[PDB]
Enzyme design. Structure first.
Site, PDB file in Angstrom:
ATOM      1  N   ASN B  42       0.830  -1.200   0.000  1.00  0.00           N
ATOM      2  CA  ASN B  42       0.000   0.000   0.000  1.00  0.00           C
ATOM      3  C   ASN B  42       0.869   1.256   0.000  1.00  0.00           C
ATOM      4  OD1 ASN B  42       0.517  -0.748   2.795  1.00  0.00           O
ATOM      5  ND2 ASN B  42      -1.333   0.373   3.469  1.00  0.00           N
ATOM      6  N   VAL B  43       0.325   2.308  -0.588  1.00  0.00           N
ATOM      7  CA  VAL B  43       0.964   3.626  -0.764  1.00  0.00           C
ATOM      8  C   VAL B  43      -0.124   4.696  -0.544  1.00  0.00           C
ATOM      9  CG1 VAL B  43       2.287   5.185  -2.212  1.00  0.00           C
ATOM     10  CG2 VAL B  43       2.550   2.672  -2.541  1.00  0.00           C
ATOM     11  N   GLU B  44      -0.040   5.293   0.632  1.00  0.00           N
ATOM     12  CA  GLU B  44      -1.005   6.288   1.038  1.00  0.00           C
ATOM     13  C   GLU B  44      -0.581   7.677   0.551  1.00  0.00           C
ATOM     14  OE1 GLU B  44      -1.393   5.688   5.260  1.00  0.00           O
ATOM     15  OE2 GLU B  44      -2.715   3.938   4.937  1.00  0.00           O
ATOM     16  N   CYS B  53      -4.073   0.673  -2.610  1.00  0.00           N
ATOM     17  CA  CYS B  53      -3.989  -0.534  -1.836  1.00  0.00           C
ATOM     18  C   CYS B  53      -2.863  -1.391  -2.368  1.00  0.00           C
ATOM     19  CB  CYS B  53      -5.320  -1.307  -1.905  1.00  0.00           C
ATOM     20  SG  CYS B  53      -6.702  -0.439  -1.084  1.00  0.00           S
ATOM     21  N   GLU B  55      -3.186  -4.317  -3.306  1.00  0.00           N
ATOM     22  CA  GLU B  55      -3.752  -5.015  -4.460  1.00  0.00           C
ATOM     23  C   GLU B  55      -3.697  -4.199  -5.750  1.00  0.00           C
ATOM     24  OE1 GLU B  55      -4.953  -4.656  -1.342  1.00  0.00           O
ATOM     25  OE2 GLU B  55      -6.661  -5.851  -1.022  1.00  0.00           O
ATOM     26  N   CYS B  89     -10.935  -3.141  -4.317  1.00  0.00           N
ATOM     27  CA  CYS B  89      -9.918  -4.100  -4.760  1.00  0.00           C
ATOM     28  C   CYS B  89     -10.546  -5.416  -5.263  1.00  0.00           C
ATOM     29  CB  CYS B  89      -8.893  -4.334  -3.665  1.00  0.00           C
ATOM     30  SG  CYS B  89      -7.814  -2.883  -3.498  1.00  0.00           S
TER      31      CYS B  89
HETATM   32 ZN   LIG Z   1      -8.322  -2.166  -1.391  1.00  0.00          ZN
END
Ligand SMILES: [Zn+2]
Ligand SMILES: [Zn+2]
Ligand SMILES: [Zn+2]
Ligand SMILES: [Zn+2]
Lengths: 120, 119, 119, 121
Positions: B42-44, B53, B55, B89
């Site tokens: 994940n990369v916010e 996400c 995914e 996702c």
């Molecule tokens: Zn997701």
């Protein structure tokens, strides 16, 4: 020191993986990380359009999946290798990982992200 | 399907997670129908709605490495526990995996077709 | 363009903000070319990437009330100070307002065209 | 409230005529009953950057909070010809936050619970 030809070649090469059956507009992108490695991405569309991922989304995902760092330069190209300007969403993504001095390939000469997204 | 290998790879990639807003790192690894494994974390983002996400990274990597169909997916949190993909996702995965894609779960994997009925 | 009215409507709607994850409520109000005002507030989600900015609400409300073009936008934070839209929202607004849409800012409003060059 | 499915479909159908969908040409309208009795509506809004598209259900959830919050009880989503549609995965997750598993979604055979549309959320 940025090899723009490497970045464009990599962005053109990865565009072949694009999943763009809805727009029929493949896009590839390649970025130089501050340790010197290059990460790539391509666009991936979805039947629910708002789930579509830009090529620059792929770039940021690969940045972190391959250990993180800072983006220094980016080339985004269409299928024919023409440079493209990231959409507003992608400018915000890229700003988190590269800041205002990130250079984006453009025919006339590169553009700073700071100029492409002022008052971030 | 080598579930141990997918879980191992998901755990490895989760160390690259960029999640300073939620402090909830996630790693994901998927088996592609040609035998290769693709990964994401994940990369916010400060604008929360721009967060990607793990995914999304898997689906980006699927296509950057030449496309194909996903066969099996393991997602893992920082405690090592399997995580169920969020709705967004699930829809993403359905496009590239269809209903028979298997997702790691405690006790036994689940079919995406059950996780996202009437797609 | 009654900037005072836009700001007050943006502050009003911000009280409906659903932002328990960031604790950063945002309200927005936009003047449409037919003189009416459309509003939105931010709506976050446990899956952060599904969060909706106040400006997404403005754009949804614009079309659910019959369409038009946006002329002026004020966005406000909890202190009632103007906020600059995130890049996603700049692209959103550009679709419905173009480069001459005005965005409230301290000292004087800014053109969307300068906030999102080479659109 | 007692759910008036006719009201919700009529209201979704009406709002669908305002959909901004020049890229897919697939207009969608949606109308939801809130737990205080009021109905909130939305239509899809597409964008040149495809992934910035907002679903009708996104509009519904934005309106819910712009109009003072609460919980969603029932939802009807319709295509351009008034036929019921199931929300996409993203929208199921959105709606789950504001309606939980017992939110009913209009469907030709009879409504479906969001809990069944999005198991183990
Ligand atoms: Zn997701
Ligand atoms: Zn983009
Ligand atoms: Zn925004
Ligand atoms: Zn949706």
């Amino acid at each position: 020191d940025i090899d723009w030809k490497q970045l464009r070649d990599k962005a053109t090469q990865v565009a072949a993986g694009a999943y763009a059956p809805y727009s029929r507009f493949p896009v590839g992108a390649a970025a130089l990380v501050d340790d010197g490695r290059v990460v790539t991405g391509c666009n991936v569309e979805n039947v629910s359009y708002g789930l579509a991922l830009c090529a620059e989304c792929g770039v940021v995902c690969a940045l972190h999946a391959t250990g993180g760092g800072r983006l220094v330069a980016l080339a985004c190209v269409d299928g024919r290798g023409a440079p493209l300007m990231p959409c507003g969403r992608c400018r915000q993504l890229l700003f988190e990982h590269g800041g205002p001095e990130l250079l984006v390939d453009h025919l006339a000469g590169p553009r700073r992200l700071g100029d492409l997204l002022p008052e971030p």
